[PDB]
């Protein structure tokens, strides 16, 4: 009888706030450049696609 | 002399092509359309790989 765990009883809530903002938001994390050489933060997004476009 | 007649313009057109080829390379970070002359683009579903 050394280490007694505890618990807390509380409702676990998957509520539903305003969704159509939250859906659009991980689009603006990815930009798209109209340039030949890019700016070393799109350039590791652009490489990550050219891997898994070569497996599907 | 038809080779000296016809290919003389083919020499100068190739000589003028060496002038514009110097123009295109430019700065390292130059353009996404000026590099779209030598390296090609095509219509839908050309590049297989």
Return the residue of B nearest to A54 by Cα. Answer: B49
User: What's the CA gap between A42 and A33, in Å, rounded?
Assistant: 8
Roughly how many angstroms between the first and final C-alpha of chain A, as a whole number? 56
Other beta carbons less than 10 A from residue B31's beta carbon: 13
Mutation target vs A (from B29, B33, B41, B47; most A CBs, 10 A cutoff): B29
SS3 content of chain B, % helix, strand, coil (to 5): 55, 0, 45
Resolution expressed in Å: 6.2
Q: Are A54 and B47 in contact (CB under 8 A)?
A: no
State in Å, rounded, how far the first CA of chain B is from the last one. 47
Cβ-Cβ pairs closer than 8 A, A with B, add up to 11
> Method used for this model?
cryo-EM
The closest alpha carbon to B36, from B46, B48, B45, B24, belongs to B24
Angle at B41 between CA A49 and CA A31, to 5 degrees: 35
Integer Cα distance of B47 and B49 in angstroms: 6
List CB contacts (< 8 A) between B30 and chain A. 36
Write out the E strands in B3-49. Answer: none
């Amino acid at each position: 009888n050394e280490n007694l765990f505890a618990s807390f009883i509380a409702p676990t809530m998957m509520g539903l706030p305003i969704v159509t903002l939250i859906i659009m938001f991980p689009s603006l994390l990815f930009p798209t450049p109209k340039r030949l050489i890019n700016n070393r933060t799109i350039s590791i997004q652009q490489w990550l696609i050219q891997l898994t476009s070569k497996q599907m | 002399a038809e080779f000296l007649s016809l290919s003389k313009a083919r020499i100068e057109a190739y000589e003028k092509e060496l002038e514009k080829m110097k123009n295109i390379i430019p700065f390292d970070q130059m353009t996404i359309e000026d590099l779209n002359e030598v390296f090609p683009e095509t219509k839908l579903d050309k590049k297989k790989y």
